[PDB]
Every structure is written in C-alpha cells, then in structure tokens.
Amino acid sequence: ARPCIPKSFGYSSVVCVCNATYCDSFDPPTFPALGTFSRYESTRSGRRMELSMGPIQANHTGTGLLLTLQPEQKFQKVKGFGGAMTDAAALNILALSPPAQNLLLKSYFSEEGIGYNIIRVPMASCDFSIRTYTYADTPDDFQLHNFSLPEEDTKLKIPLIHRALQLAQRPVSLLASPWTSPTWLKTNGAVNGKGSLKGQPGDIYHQTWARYFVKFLDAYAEHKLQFWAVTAENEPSAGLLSGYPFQCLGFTPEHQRDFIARDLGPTLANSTHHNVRLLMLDDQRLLLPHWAKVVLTDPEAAKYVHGIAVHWYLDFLAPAKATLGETHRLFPNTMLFASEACVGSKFWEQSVRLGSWDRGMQYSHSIITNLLYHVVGWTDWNLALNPEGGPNWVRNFVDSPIIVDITKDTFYKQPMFYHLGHFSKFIPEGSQRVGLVASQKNDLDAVALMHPDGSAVVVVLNRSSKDVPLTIKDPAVGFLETISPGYSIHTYLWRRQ
Amino acid sequence: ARPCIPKSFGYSSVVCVCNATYCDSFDPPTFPALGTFSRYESTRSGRRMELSMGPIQANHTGTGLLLTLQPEQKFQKVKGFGGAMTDAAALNILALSPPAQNLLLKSYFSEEGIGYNIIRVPMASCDFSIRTYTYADTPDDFQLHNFSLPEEDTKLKIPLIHRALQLAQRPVSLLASPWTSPTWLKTNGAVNGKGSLKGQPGDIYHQTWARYFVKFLDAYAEHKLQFWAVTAENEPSAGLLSGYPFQCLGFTPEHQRDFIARDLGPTLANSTHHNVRLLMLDDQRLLLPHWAKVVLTDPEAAKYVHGIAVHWYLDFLAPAKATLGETHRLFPNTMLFASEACVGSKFWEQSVRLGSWDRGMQYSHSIITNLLYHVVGWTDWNLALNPEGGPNWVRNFVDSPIIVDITKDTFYKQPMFYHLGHFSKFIPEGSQRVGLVASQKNDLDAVALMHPDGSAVVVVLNRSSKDVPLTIKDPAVGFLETISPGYSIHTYLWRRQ
Ligand SMILES: *[C@@H]1O[C@H](CO)[C@@H](O[C@@H]2O[C@H](CO)[C@@H](O[C@@H]3O[C@H](CO)[C@@H](O)[C@H](O)[C@@H]3O)[C@H](O)[C@H]2NC(C)=O)[C@H](O)[C@H]1NC(C)=O
Ligand SMILES: *[C@@H]1O[C@H](CO)[C@@H](O[C@@H]2O[C@H](CO)[C@@H](O[C@@H]3O[C@H](CO)[C@@H](O)[C@H](O)[C@@H]3O)[C@H](O)[C@H]2NC(C)=O)[C@H](O)[C@H]1NC(C)=O
Ligand SMILES: *[C@@H]1O[C@H](CO)[C@@H](O[C@@H]2O[C@H](CO)[C@@H](O)[C@H](O)[C@H]2NC(C)=O)[C@H](O)[C@H]1NC(C)=O
Ligand SMILES: *[C@@H]1O[C@H](CO)[C@@H](O)[C@H](O)[C@H]1NC(C)=O
Ligand SMILES: *[C@@H]1O[C@H](CO)[C@@H](O)[C@H](O)[C@H]1NC(C)=O
Ligand SMILES: O[C@H]1[C@H](O)[C@@H](F)C=C[C@@H]1O
Ligand SMILES: O[C@H]1[C@H](O)[C@@H](F)C=C[C@@H]1O
Ligand SMILES: O[C@H]1[C@H](O)[C@@H](F)C=C[C@@H]1O
Ligand SMILES: O[C@H]1[C@H](O)[C@@H](F)C=C[C@@H]1O
Ligand SMILES: [Ca+2]
Ligand code: NA
C-alpha cells in the first residue's frame, strides 16, 4: 500500500496528491480470518480508507447503541458504482503524462483503487464538451448515411474506456445517455433551448432518433465496446424549459411513454443490441412516482423498460419514501438506479472546493439514502475536471472527485473520491441490501449488505461532530465493538462462514 | 383613454413609457347593452388592452373553432390578483418624482389601471432588500421585548401600501410571508444557508416564532393595516438546501404540519388576529399533493389551514393535473392560490428584457393554467425593479412588469403588466370560473368566468404565430364571431341578461 500524501487548500479537509510516480493505493483485497473484521476509516482530520482489524466476540453487554444485522431480511441487489467519461473528463485525464493517467485510472477501476464497475458515456456533446456536435449533423439525413463517431469518441473516450476495462477485475458496465438529437430532428432547430423531437412518436423523426441509438451502439461495437444499458434521454424535463442553456431534448412523461412503446423499444428489440437494457426518466427523483405511473401502466412501454434512472440535483424537494419508496411499492420488479450526481451546479455553489469534507458527506449521505430505498447503483458525473471545474462550453463548472492540475502533472483525490470508494470498493455487483436495526435513536447514517459469497459489509457515516461508540451484532457470528468518530465514515467487512 | 407611448429596447415588443406628466390609462366602463360584447386586445405588434365592441348573433354556421361556455358548470370563486411590496419595489417606486409615483400606483391599483386587489408583504428582509434584518435581532429575546418595525416598513412599505389602498376602489387583501426568523431561533445562526428552527414544534423556539407572527400583525395594526392572510413560511424547502444563498427557514412537510398544529394555528387563533387566514406550502407546486396529504390528514393542523399557496418556478416539472388537480380532488374545500412568480431567477435568464412578449405570454399562460386547475388567485413578485432587476443584496436580479429608470424619472410598463391586466382588471373578487369546451384541438389558452354582476369574461391567449378565426357561444345570448391574431391576448366581456 501507499498512503495519502495530504495537501490543504484552506477547506475543511485535505486532498490526496498523486502524480507520474506516486499515488495512494491499497494492497490486494482479502477477507481476514473468520472471527475477525476489517474496518476502513476516513476522517475529516485526514485518515483515508485506513485499514484496521478487530475481533468478533461471542457476547455483548451495555445500554449503548446496537445495530443488529438482519441477514434474513433481503432487499435489492446492487448493479454497481462509477462515474462519467465526458469529453471534459477525457481531456483532463489525457492532459496528464501517461504514467499519471494510469495512476488515475487505477485509482478508480483497479482493486489497488476503489473498484468502479460503471462508466456513463454521453451520446455525443453535452455541457462538459468544448465543441457542440452530434453523430449526425449533416442536415435531413433521415437514412443516417452520414452518422459517425468523431475524434472525441475515437481518440479520447473509447481508448480511455478500453484502458479502464483492462485495469478492472470485476466486469465494467457501460451506460449511454444522449443530451441532444441532431438539430434537424428538433422543433427549435438548436442543441439547447426549449425544444422536442418534431412530430409525434411513431413518425419519421422518432424512427430516425430511435435508429440513431442503434447506430451509436453499432459504432461502439466496431471499437469492441458493448453497453449494459442506455437511458431514453438525459434530463428530458430540461428541454421543456425556456432558454435551457445547453444540450437537451424535451419529453413530457407521455411523450417518453409513446417514444419508448412505438420507436425506441421496438428498434432496440429488433436489433443485435436487444440485450441492452433501457432505463427511463434519467431525471430528478421528485418526478417519481408520477413518471413511473405514466410510462409503466402502458403495457406496450412497460415491456421495454428495465429500470428507472434518477439524478440527485433536487433531492432536497423529494423525500426518499414518497418518491423512491412509493415507486418500488408500485413497480417492485423495475429497478431504480442513480445515474448522475455532482456538487457545484447551483449558482451559489463554488465550482471546486479542494478538500471539501462537506461534499464527501453529501456523496455518502446520498448513496446511503439511495441504498435504503431500493436503489441498485450510484453514478458520479465527470470522472475528472480541471481546478476551474471545466472545461465546459457554457461555463457550467462543477466539482469532481479528482481534480487534474496539468501545470504540475498532478491530480488531487478529494473527500468525494473516498466517500464514494467506501461503497464502490466493498459492494460488488450482486451484493444484496439486508436489514440493520438500531436499538435506539441516533445521528448516524448506516446500511448493511451481503456479498454474493455470503460475507457482510456495513457502511457507517457520522455527519455529526460527536463520537458515537456502537456495537454491530451479526446474530450468527457475534459482536463488533467500535466507535463512529465525528466527521468520519467507516466500512466494516467480515466473513460469516 | 390615454394610449401607450411605445419604446423598443430591441426585444420582441415595446414597453409603454410613463413619466411625471404622462402615463397610458383607461376610460370608465360604459357597460354595453345586451347583444353587444367588449374586446380588449394586446399584441406583440404593439396593441395594449385596446377596446373594441362587436355584435352577438342569434345564429352561427361554419367548421371553424367554436368555444362553448357551460355557465351551469361552476368551479372556484376568485380571490384576486396583485404583486409584492418588497423593500426593492418600495425603493424603486419612491425613486420616482411624486407625480410619476402616483401614475405607477394608479397603473396597478385604480380603475383607470388594472385593478390589483392583492399585495404580498415580506415579514422583514428577503433577497429583494438592501440589508438583512428581522423584526427581533436582539439576541435570545424570547419575550420579543425588542420586536420592532424598522424604517423599511414604517417609512417605505407601510406608506406606499396606504397609498395603494386609497387609489383602489376594490377592497385590497394583504398577504404576509416570512423568509427568515431571527438567527438566534435557528440551528445554523444565520439568515441564509441550510437551517431550521431549533428544537421541535411545541417548544420555546416554535412558541416564540409563532408569537412573532402576532407581534408582526399587532405592529401593522398600530399603522392601521389589517391582513387577509399569512403563509406559514416563504419556500420552506429552500432552508433544506446546503448554502441556500438568501433568507430562508427550512421545514419538511411534517415540521410544517407540527408547527401549524402546535404553535402557529393556536397562537393566531387565540389572538385578536384569529380571522386572518393561514396558507400552507408557499412553495413549488411539484410538492403537491404530498405536502397537502402530510399537513391536511392531521386534523389538529387541518383545522387552522385555509389554503395552499404555490410558486411557479418549477412548473415545467409539475403537470397541473397531477399537482393542482389531484390536490383539488383530495382537498376540494382547501383553496389553491398562486402567491409568487417572476422571470429571471434561473442562472441563464437575462434579469430584465425590456419589452419581452415571451415573458408576457409566460404570465398569461401560467394564470390561465392555474385558473383551469381550481386556483383562486395569482400574485406577481416585485411590483417594480430598476433596469438591473434590483436592488438585491445577493444580486439575485429578476424581471418585473414595471421597470423604474431613476436617471430619467421614467418607468416602463412591460408586456407582463398588460398580460396580468387582462385578468386583474376584468376578474374581480367573487368571479366564478365556469366551463368552456372547444369543438376541436387548438393552440389557444382560454378560460371563462362569470363576474359577480352575472356578466361573462373570457380570456383567449394565442402563443402561436398563426391567426385563429374563432366563435364563442354563450347559450344565454348567442355567438361572438372573432379572430385570435398570432401573439395576441384578448379579454371578452358581455352582459348575459
Ligand atoms: C510526485 O509526488 C511525490 C510525493 O510528494 C514526490 O516525492 C517527494 O519529493 C519531495 C521533494 O523531494 C520529498 O520531500 C522531502 O521529504 C524528506 C523526508 O522524507 C524531507 O527531509 C525533505 O525536506 C522533503 O520534505 C518527499 O519525501 C518525496 N516523497 C516521496 C514519497 O517520494 C515526487 O517528487 C513527485 N514527482 C514529481 C515528478 O514531481
Ligand atoms: C413625458 O412623456 C411624454 C410622452 O412621451 C412627453 O411628451 C412628449 O413631449 C415632446 C416634447 O415636448 C412632444 O413633442 C413635441 O410635439 C409637438 C406637437 O404637439 C411638436 O410641435 C414639437 O416639435 C415636439 O415634437 C410630444 O408631442 C409629447 N408627447 C405626448 C404624447 O404628450 C413629455 O415631454 C415627457 N415629459 C418629461 C418631463 O419627460
Ligand atoms: C337560427 O337559430 C335558431 C335557434 O336554433 C333556429 O331555429 C330553430 O331551428 C331548429 C333546426 O332547424 C328547429 O328544430 C327549431 O325548432 C327552431 N327553433 C325555434 C325557436 O324556432 C333557426 O333556424 C336558425 N336560423 C337560420 C337562418 O339558420
Ligand atoms: C453522406 O453520405 C453519403 C453516402 O455515404 C456520401 O456520399 C456523402 O458525401 C456524405 N455527405 C457528407 C456531407 O459527408
Ligand atoms: C429591549 O427592550 C427592553 C424593554 O423595553 C429595554 O429595556 C432594552 O433596552 C431593549 N434592548 C435593546 C437592545 O433595544
Ligand atoms: O449535463 C449535466 C450537468 O453538467 C449537471 F450540472 C447537471 C445535470 C446535467 O445532466
Ligand atoms: O482509528 C480507530 C477508529 O476510530 C476506531 F473505530 C477503532 C479503531 C481504529 O484504530
Ligand atoms: O425571494 C424569492 C426570489 O426573489 C425569487 F427569485 C424566487 C423565489 C423566492 O421566494
Ligand atoms: O384588432 C381587431 C381584432 O384583432 C379582431 F379580433 C376584431 C376587432 C379588432 O379591431
Ligand atoms: Ca426558487
Ligand atoms: Na471552458
């Protein structure tokens, strides 16, 4: 292992500094012996997924907080965790020296790092691009004869995705999302602003747009990349808004229902890509359960929809129980998946706060809340940005777990990296959320899961300043006596057999 | 009477220029005889509530669009229309010479103007203030011995409100809303940011905050002003958001429920202000019907709640049927009221676009949609702003139907003013929405109401470029043959007996 080289930028915690020759890393992952637990600890004070071990004991006495595992009580199975290979992320990563690039990719995708198994891939340009383009800009090409991947794909995104997949031990799932169609398919004839596809579902405009998804998947398959899933549209509600500043395509839930039933579903289903999953919504969770009711009560749309993708940006408006909870209750066989999150997109939010513990706690608090309300995965936005939070053609600068400093051939791993890693590293695909009952009222955020192989993982987040002694009971194995320090996050793992 | 002096600022339409000696106005109503209708027409081309009259026919033949009044299909009674007397609006109005001031107030409040009958009054400071203050900034003053109105109230707002009332021939209803409590009642000790009242409903903090509402109403009563209603908090969800940039006070729906049941409801009820109405939510309509269910299913909260106030800012997310419609279905005896709207609060929106027809159409489309889904009133934000869209201590600049140019002792009446006046002038308190059906699919927004005197009022908005020839049928009087020009709004009046 190599420890965090800390650096303060005057925010509440430190970044870890990496460069061509040095990056913090883990030893190969193993379980300790039966009767022993592993603890990984990060703290605002500067600990970064530090490994310690403790005994699992037969007995426990006291009035202190007890968290009892309910291994029998089974909820959702996890798909995974990861981040977005935008044009901006690819430009920032490739601006590093080759050896610094490999340390950045290993930080995310290897077992020496935090084991990402999801990459979100924009279908052509978004705000996190320096050029506005689609795959089919030649006007009125309804045959899509002039469809092609430009260098942003063939020289930047695709070679980096190959390198991430070569570094991973667990299979990586690619998820594709479009921001805009070609402008000649749009009511407003622009990549941005208030605008939808022309005409109506089932017509030439909608058939062309559905065929564009197949052409994209065909083009990535020529480069030997296969997709796990696509979303029906990034933030379809954005294209309903006067003056929307960057690439968008407006759908009402009824429009999305009919597009999916008539065009996108059947076009994917009758293609070599019929196994690729389709996720609906890809938008704020306040739109649930309404959007789920509109699309999924139509059996002709419902038969094509695998999952519901959610964005975190207005989660303050949207209590988990009334949105995620109610959607699961109504449509329990349709998975919920968190497809995009970043801090810094609000006008008052500073783009980049190097070393922000607050932004780390926002990430882990969101992931825990999502996992407690049936969500099967959580996806970061840009994998890497510059110290400005760009590049971004409309200056919609945001924060990222890794900030590249090209003048120093350096990258900074922020608290958000470690907060996400406390989940991504220790919750492999197929892990099943299980119950975890508190003996009393407490200020902690916690979730428990069981690995496919039967091992236990518990994540404990303390967003308070107060240390909280606690015990974890596994009814078949015993008791973990521990503490949750103020401004900490812990991941606990142990064999059950 | 006195026509628009048009000026173009290079946007889609003209503003009407007013100064110390000249402002556009109306003549008194002539009440045309049975068999004649009145038409008020505004157009992007520059017509400003121009009056024409036409015949009503016994008969109609054709395949053209027919709108049929259903006078026996009766819905909500209207409370009214108006705007907000913020510190910013008061400073802008008082920056004019006294003659220009009275022409501005006459524009809004007189029968020679557009007959406003609602004024929303911030309870102490908001973003549209040049300094941050509450009425009780002396620390830990739980007795509220040091509660007092500053000069923003006693020298600016209160005298201007008295002047508006005197110019109005219609009874004016005052609506009060707080943004923040004293910081010493808050978890975060700041006017802004993520923070709620300390403790829990029914405690000293919540009792003091409820008493502050009574002290506010007592102080305004010392100045000879009485309120129609208060809201429980301006945008309570804002206080739940990290770094929220201006005055706020966070409540979850459960917190608002328990605050109303235990503190605000009983405190107002046991005061000389027991007749003042209490409106809940005062927030984005996407929070409906959830907030209505959380608050109104508690009988101890429900007995104090007159109505639900909604803001328009995230209407693009929130279909009227799924929000206002469902809330009306579930809680038909709890009135819905639109308490705040402005254009320019989104980061990509230019603060002020002098003469924007687009912003005018946003207002009338919102008012018509609200009226078609049971809403009893519609309230603008700042009554007036400067050309920068301020002043505003956090530079959250926005647009206003009247813009004051202090350097020229001039104010500009924008399309938003006329689009609102198409409703406010012709739909007094007690008007009842009635049924209006179309013979075919159309691009028009239309609503029919019956004046208390029994006369008909129909507003027709055309947001398309295409002239639409139209017939209106009133089964009591016969047929109006008319045309809805592209980018027009019309109000139609006629006697029914
Ligand atoms: C890439 O980053 C690594 C890690 O920061 C850089 O290595 C480090 O270089 C500095 C300056 O030479 C070393 O500082 C020194 O520490 C010794 C005691 O260990 C102290 O006596 C000196 O006064 C000084 O503070 C640091 O030890 C060293 N760290 C490691 C782990 O090698 C490296 O230079 C960077 N590479 C490039 C190409 O910029
Ligand atoms: C307040 O606004 C009104 C309306 O714009 C201003 O009135 C306008 O004033 C100009 C300058 O006096 C008038 O122009 C003159 O018209 C006469 C013919 O009547 C002509 O002989 C002169 O050569 C000159 O063009 C204009 O007619 C008048 N408009 C109206 C509608 O009254 C007024 O000046 C403004 N006052 C202040 C203090 O800003
Ligand atoms: C004008 O409208 C009146 C009212 O409907 C028409 O009169 C009636 O015509 C219908 C259909 O032909 C008859 O069934 C009714 O019995 C008539 N009612 C009355 C009260 O007379 C009239 O025909 C129309 N005039 C024209 C020129 O088309
Ligand atoms: C579009 O594709 C056709 C057929 O492959 C080709 O001949 C034509 O030149 C292309 N047009 C452009 C603008 O590239
Ligand atoms: C608060 O009110 C009390 C009682 O009227 C008074 O004695 C005291 O001076 C006031 N304090 C301030 C700071 O105004
Ligand atoms: O394109 C992204 C944007 O960069 C981020 F700010 C939020 C939502 C959008 O999907
Ligand atoms: O750093 C400590 C941790 O805070 C506590 F929970 C137990 C063991 C670790 O060494
Ligand atoms: O205070 C107002 C603000 O001025 C406006 F931008 C929108 C919402 C708030 O209530
Ligand atoms: O300006 C016109 C209007 O457009 C039409 F509806 C009828 C009468 C008016 O003169
Ligand atoms: Ca707002
Ligand atoms: Na840039």
Side-chain angles (χ1 to χ4, degrees), chain A residues 1-168 170-440 442-497, chain B residues 1-302 304-440 442-465 467-497:
Chain A
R2 301 197 100 170
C4 178
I5 311 278
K7 186 168 170 85
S8 177
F9 283 92
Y11 295 100
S12 57
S13 199
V14 297
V15 305
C16 302
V17 185
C18 297
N19 64 15
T21 63
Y22 193 94
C23 202
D24 52 300
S25 62
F26 299 97
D27 296 311
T30 59
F31 283 110
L34 178 69
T36 303
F37 70 86
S38 296
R39 174 202 292 97
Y40 294 83
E41 169 168 64
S42 306
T43 68
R44 187 176 75 169
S45 71
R47 300 180 186 162
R48 292 285 178 281
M49 304 181 76
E50 295 191 347
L51 173 56
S52 63
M53 298 188 188
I56 303 178
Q57 307 171 256
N59 293 106
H60 160 82
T61 320
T63 61
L65 176 59
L66 184 66
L67 301 185
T68 302
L69 195 72
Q70 313 292 306
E72 312 88 354
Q73 184 187 46
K74 306 305 196 179
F75 299 89
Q76 78 276 22
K77 284 179 181 205
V78 169
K79 176 65 201 180
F81 302 88
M85 189 67 81
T86 58
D87 296 347
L91 280 166
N92 281 302
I93 293 163
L94 289 159
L96 286 170
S97 63
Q101 292 173 12
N102 290 323
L103 289 177
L104 188 155
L105 292 172
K106 283 181 181 159
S107 289
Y108 277 135
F109 294 101
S110 65
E111 307 300 342
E112 290 168 42
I114 66 169
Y116 272 15
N117 73 319
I118 299 186
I119 308 171
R120 185 143 175 262
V121 188
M123 289 165 66
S125 68
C126 67
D127 58 321
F128 278 99
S129 296
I130 56 171
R131 189 172 77 86
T132 67
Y133 64 88
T134 74
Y135 300 135
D137 286 329
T138 301
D140 303 338
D141 182 24
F142 292 92
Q143 310 160 278
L144 291 179
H145 288 171
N146 307 122
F147 183 107
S148 66
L149 302 180
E151 293 193 344
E152 287 83 358
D153 300 78
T154 66
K155 296 206 177 304
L156 288 70
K157 287 158 68 187
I158 286 172
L160 277 179
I161 293 163
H162 278 303
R163 293 163 60 194
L165 268 55
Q166 288 169 246
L167 292 175
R170 12 207 227 196
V172 178
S173 291
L174 307 186
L175 167 69
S177 304
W179 275 244
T180 192
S181 64
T183 63
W184 49 268
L185 289 173
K186 299 186 58 179
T187 52
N188 61 326
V191 295
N192 56 1
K194 180 181 173 158
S196 69
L197 290 168
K198 294 186 153 169
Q200 60 187 92
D203 77 4
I204 190 176
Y205 304 104
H206 288 69
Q207 284 277 303
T208 299
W209 183 233
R211 186 175 292 87
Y212 180 111
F213 276 73
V214 167
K215 279 261 168 186
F216 166 81
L217 298 171
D218 287 346
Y220 267 63
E222 295 182 25
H223 287 89
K224 314 305 182 172
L225 295 174
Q226 164 178 2
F227 280 77
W228 156 60
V230 304
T231 74
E233 179 50 30
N234 183 65
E235 302 202 336
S237 67
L240 304 183
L241 201 43
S242 178
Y244 199 73
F246 62 80
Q247 294 91 320
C248 57
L249 188 61
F251 299 80
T252 60
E254 294 75 21
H255 190 169
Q256 176 159 108
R257 179 195 61 206
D258 294 332
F259 173 55
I260 285 176
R262 295 180 193 167
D263 306 303
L264 183 53
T267 298
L268 285 173
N270 184 46
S271 82
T272 60
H273 310 292
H274 58 92
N275 291 139
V276 175
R277 310 297 205 166
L278 173 61
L279 309 187
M280 66 169 277
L281 187 54
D282 201 17
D283 212 333
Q284 310 320 323
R285 77 169 178 230
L286 65 88
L287 292 171
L288 296 174
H290 180 68
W291 271 59
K293 292 177 171 170
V294 170
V295 173
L296 294 175
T297 60
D298 186 324
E300 291 311 300
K303 69 177 172 185
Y304 294 121
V305 176
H306 175 67
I308 303 163
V310 296
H311 292 197
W312 89 332
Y313 298 97
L314 299 181
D315 280 0
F316 80 100
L317 282 164
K321 178 171 200 181
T323 54
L324 297 178
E326 184 60 10
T327 302
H328 173 72
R329 193 187 69 76
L330 291 170
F331 306 105
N333 297 115
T334 301
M335 61 80 126
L336 294 161
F337 181 78
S339 59
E340 201 190 294
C342 67
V343 188
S345 77
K346 278 162 194 76
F347 73 78
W348 64 85
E349 286 173 339
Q350 179 183 351
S351 298
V352 176
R353 281 172 83 84
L354 278 170
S356 176
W357 194 252
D358 173 79
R359 290 177 182 200
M361 294 192 296
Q362 291 192 231
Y363 270 41
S364 51
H365 182 61
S366 177
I367 295 160
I368 291 164
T369 302
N370 276 270
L371 290 169
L372 294 178
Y373 289 91
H374 311 287
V375 173
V376 302
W378 198 104
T379 318
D380 190 28
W381 193 206
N382 302 276
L383 285 169
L385 291 175
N386 70 24
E388 194 171 29
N392 186 294
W393 74 277
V394 299
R395 300 191 76 77
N396 183 43
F397 299 126
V398 309
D399 217 335
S400 173
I402 297 187
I403 298 294
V404 179
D405 187 348
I406 299 306
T407 60
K408 297 205 181 70
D409 196 34
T410 289
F411 61 96
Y412 305 121
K413 302 161 70 171
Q414 302 214 67
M416 287 183 285
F417 174 91
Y418 301 92
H419 276 78
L420 225 176
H422 269 272
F423 305 87
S424 64
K425 190 168 167 67
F426 302 122
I427 308 172
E429 184 171 2
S431 301
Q432 187 161 33
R433 206 226 322 165
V434 303
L436 188 67
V437 306
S439 62
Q440 60 189 53
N442 67 83
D443 299 312
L444 301 181
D445 303 295
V447 60
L449 307 96
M450 181 174 300
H451 288 203
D453 70 18
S455 311
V457 49
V458 173
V459 180
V460 179
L461 170 67
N462 190 342
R463 291 190 292 114
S464 89
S465 65
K466 163 180 206 60
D467 295 354
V468 179
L470 70 90
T471 319
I472 298 173
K473 180 181 182 171
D474 183 341
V477 185
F479 298 87
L480 294 71
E481 303 289 355
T482 192
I483 323 153
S484 171
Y487 302 127
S488 76
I489 180 169
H490 288 189
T491 306
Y492 293 95
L493 297 103
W494 64 91
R495 279 177 51 194
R496 301 194 70 241
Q497 215 178 311
Chain B
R2 189 155 264 171
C4 180
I5 302 298
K7 179 167 182 154
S8 171
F9 283 96
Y11 300 96
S12 60
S13 197
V14 295
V15 303
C16 298
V17 184
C18 296
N19 64 13
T21 56
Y22 190 95
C23 200
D24 52 297
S25 65
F26 300 98
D27 295 306
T30 62
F31 308 103
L34 182 67
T36 300
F37 72 80
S38 287
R39 173 199 296 103
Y40 293 87
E41 168 171 63
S42 304
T43 64
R44 185 170 83 168
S45 62
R47 297 177 186 164
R48 291 288 179 274
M49 297 183 74
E50 288 182 356
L51 175 57
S52 60
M53 294 193 193
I56 297 167
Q57 324 284 125
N59 294 81
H60 163 81
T61 317
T63 61
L65 176 56
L66 177 66
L67 304 190
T68 304
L69 210 88
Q70 300 180 319
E72 292 314 313
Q73 295 307 303
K74 293 183 185 303
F75 300 94
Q76 79 272 27
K77 299 216 179 159
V78 165
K79 178 65 203 183
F81 301 88
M85 189 69 71
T86 56
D87 298 346
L91 289 164
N92 278 299
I93 295 170
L94 290 169
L96 291 168
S97 64
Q101 294 176 13
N102 289 311
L103 288 177
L104 189 159
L105 292 174
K106 280 172 178 158
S107 292
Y108 275 136
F109 290 105
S110 77
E111 296 298 318
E112 303 101 277
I114 65 166
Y116 270 14
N117 75 321
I118 303 192
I119 304 167
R120 183 145 176 260
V121 183
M123 295 169 58
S125 64
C126 69
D127 59 319
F128 280 98
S129 295
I130 56 171
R131 71 160 195 119
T132 69
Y133 62 83
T134 75
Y135 298 136
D137 287 328
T138 302
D140 309 344
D141 177 27
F142 290 94
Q143 292 160 289
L144 294 177
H145 283 171
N146 308 114
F147 184 103
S148 85
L149 302 180
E151 289 189 350
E152 287 85 0
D153 299 76
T154 67
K155 298 212 152 278
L156 276 40
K157 287 161 60 185
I158 283 164
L160 277 175
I161 292 158
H162 279 299
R163 289 166 64 187
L165 291 168
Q166 185 52 44
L167 290 176
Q169 307 303 105
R170 306 185 203 178
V172 175
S173 289
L174 302 186
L175 172 64
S177 302
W179 272 242
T180 187
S181 61
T183 59
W184 52 267
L185 291 172
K186 299 184 59 179
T187 56
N188 66 329
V191 297
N192 60 353
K194 184 180 172 173
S196 65
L197 295 168
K198 294 187 143 168
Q200 64 187 85
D203 82 359
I204 182 167
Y205 300 108
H206 288 68
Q207 285 288 102
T208 301
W209 183 227
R211 285 183 47 249
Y212 182 108
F213 278 82
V214 168
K215 289 211 91 82
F216 170 80
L217 297 171
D218 289 341
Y220 263 69
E222 290 173 339
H223 282 91
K224 310 307 192 215
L225 291 178
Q226 274 75 49
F227 280 80
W228 156 61
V230 302
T231 71
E233 172 61 22
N234 178 70
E235 301 204 339
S237 64
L240 303 179
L241 183 46
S242 160
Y244 198 79
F246 61 79
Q247 291 93 320
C248 60
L249 185 66
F251 299 75
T252 64
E254 294 78 20
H255 192 176
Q256 170 156 113
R257 174 197 67 203
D258 293 333
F259 173 53
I260 291 181
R262 296 176 194 177
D263 307 300
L264 186 56
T267 299
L268 288 169
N270 179 229
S271 83
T272 62
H273 310 295
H274 56 95
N275 294 138
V276 174
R277 306 292 201 173
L278 177 55
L279 313 184
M280 66 163 278
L281 186 65
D282 205 11
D283 209 336
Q284 313 317 321
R285 76 160 178 235
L286 66 87
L287 294 170
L288 293 177
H290 182 62
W291 273 57
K293 293 176 185 174
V294 172
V295 178
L296 301 175
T297 58
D298 192 337
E300 204 61 32
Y304 297 114
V305 176
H306 176 69
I308 300 161
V310 299
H311 292 194
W312 89 332
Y313 297 100
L314 300 183
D315 280 0
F316 79 94
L317 282 166
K321 183 180 195 213
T323 57
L324 303 173
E326 187 60 10
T327 303
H328 177 77
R329 190 177 70 76
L330 291 170
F331 304 102
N333 303 128
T334 301
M335 60 82 118
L336 299 160
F337 178 85
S339 55
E340 195 189 302
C342 69
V343 187
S345 74
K346 305 211 168 38
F347 70 78
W348 61 85
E349 285 175 341
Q350 167 177 1
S351 304
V352 180
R353 292 172 73 84
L354 279 166
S356 168
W357 193 254
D358 176 79
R359 290 177 179 201
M361 293 186 297
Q362 284 195 58
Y363 270 34
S364 52
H365 177 251
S366 177
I367 294 161
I368 293 165
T369 303
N370 273 272
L371 291 171
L372 289 173
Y373 287 88
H374 309 284
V375 174
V376 304
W378 201 103
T379 319
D380 190 26
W381 191 208
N382 303 276
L383 285 163
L385 291 173
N386 67 27
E388 183 175 36
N392 191 291
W393 75 273
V394 301
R395 305 189 70 72
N396 183 35
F397 300 130
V398 305
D399 219 335
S400 168
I402 299 196
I403 298 299
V404 170
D405 190 356
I406 186 182
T407 63
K408 297 187 192 171
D409 191 31
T410 291
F411 61 100
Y412 304 116
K413 298 159 73 174
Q414 305 212 248
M416 283 183 287
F417 172 92
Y418 300 95
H419 282 254
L420 232 174
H422 268 91
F423 304 89
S424 65
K425 191 171 169 67
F426 303 118
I427 312 176
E429 185 162 14
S431 300
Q432 181 161 34
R433 198 233 317 183
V434 304
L436 187 76
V437 294
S439 57
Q440 45 176 296
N442 64 81
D443 293 326
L444 304 188
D445 302 291
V447 62
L449 308 96
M450 296 187 26
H451 190 286
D453 72 15
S455 62
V457 49
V458 175
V459 188
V460 178
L461 168 70
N462 189 350
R463 289 181 310 115
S464 85
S465 52
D467 297 348
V468 178
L470 158 71
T471 304
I472 304 157
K473 175 178 189 187
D474 180 345
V477 295
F479 294 89
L480 281 78
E481 304 292 352
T482 194
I483 163 86
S484 177
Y487 303 128
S488 74
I489 177 164
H490 287 189
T491 309
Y492 294 95
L493 319 181
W494 66 91
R495 292 167 67 151
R496 303 192 65 245
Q497 79 156 226

